[PDB]
Amino acid sequence: PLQTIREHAKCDDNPRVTDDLLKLYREAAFEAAELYTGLSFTPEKTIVEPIRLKGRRGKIILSATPIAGRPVVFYGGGLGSPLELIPRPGSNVLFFPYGSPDRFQTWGDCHTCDVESQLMATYVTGRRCENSVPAGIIIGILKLIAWNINNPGDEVMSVRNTLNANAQGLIGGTNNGAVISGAQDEWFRYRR
């Protein structure tokens, strides 16, 4: 909320750049966060995804870590009959059982050249009535907001990455935002 943004950034009874610029800063912070992280707002927890075979024993990396033990269903990809698999809690790497249950191939065809229907998988990355928590990554957003309030763009601010120098007599550089404010190292916790 706007009042929460204000009371965090200390802009309270001390009017800074107006609510229009505050909501613009928020709209830009919502295109910086979950774009550096990769998450998607309200993504409909159940996910269908074409999973790609990788390896002889075939690790399958689930792009949304289906909770803990709800059986992800695999179908297609030469697999005539779908099958369940209960995944890892915390990690999303499983192994496709090399023992095949069936191979419904279609040798000989000139309309599709009988290549394949790719292996696809359906799962959920949901939860309880407390389905998900977009908090924790709100603190970096608020810090970015406050940094952009008190850094309009004329004060020289630059932290240094490399120790020796860059090449020449220039004043280093990391002057980006969301990192000189502490947002990147708070969003990295939700980053693979």
Binding site: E44, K45, T46, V48, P71, V73, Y75, G76, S81, P82, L83, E84, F104, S117, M120, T122, V124, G126, R127, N131
Partner: protein
């Protein structure tokens, strides 16, 4: 082409989805039942889908439709003025939309609500053409019979319809396809509701029903 991924019913503004439509178009819709049918490991989907259309805003049509009959090779003439009861008193500028004219003949629109329809040589069947009186659009259907007895009477296609048999369901990837055509007599702003009942099947031969809804909004120019 539209595409909808349906909710798999796992306990995880309106409820029905949004579909825009333009008067005259005939588009295609895809639904991916994979999320709901894959966990129910069986024989996939079955071609037992059922549709139903309702109207939640109609704005009843100003001009009425009409129907005629004639034998093959014989020219057919009729009127176009007794189909538009006008409440006020004003002029009538009859017009035959060129984009929705006849398909197997030609029509000579006279000056005052009169026309003559010459069917193509050696053609027996049904033909339609969509007139427009004072902007109000209505269809006129003519059936050319093969001089023996008669042909049946067509059902006066609705503003929004799904064709009889153009649907297909792929049990290998759990996708349903169908066609959604909008009559050229549709009125901009109106809203209809298409309910779809799709039936799956288990390994033994029992049923898993699934119901969804969609909100069609007739909008002009996209």
């Amino acid at each position: 082409m539209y595409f909808f991924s349906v909710d798999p019913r796992n306990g995880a503004s309106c409820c029905c989805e949004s579909i825009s439509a333009r008067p005259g178009e005939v588009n295609g819709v895809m639904v991916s039942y994979a999320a709901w049918s894959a966990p129910l490991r069986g024989h996939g989907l079955t071609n037992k889908t059922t549709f139903e259309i309702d109207g939640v805003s109609v704005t009843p049509p100003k001009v009425s439709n009409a129907f005629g009959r004639t034998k093959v090779g014989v020219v057919f003439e009729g009127t176009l003025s007794d189909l538009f009861p006008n409440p006020e008193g004003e002029q009538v500028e009859y017009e035959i939309s060129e984009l929705n004219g006849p398909s197997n003949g030609v029509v000579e629109l006279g000056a005052n609500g009169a026309f003559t329809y010459t069917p193509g040589a050696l053609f027996t069947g049904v033909d339609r053409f969509w007139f427009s009186i004072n902007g109000n659009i209505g269809e006129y259907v003519i059936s050319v019979d093969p001089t023996t007895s008669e042909l049946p009477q067509p059902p006066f296609t609705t503003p929004v319809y799904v064709p009889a048999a153009r649907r297909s369901v792929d049990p290998r990837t759990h996708v349903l396809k169908f066609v959604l055509g909008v009559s050229p007599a549709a009125i901009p702003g109106d809203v209809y509701r298409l309910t779809v009942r799709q039936v799956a099947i288990d390994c033994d031969g029992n049923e898993f029903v699934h119901i969804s809804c969609y909100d069609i909004s007739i909008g002009s120019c996209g």
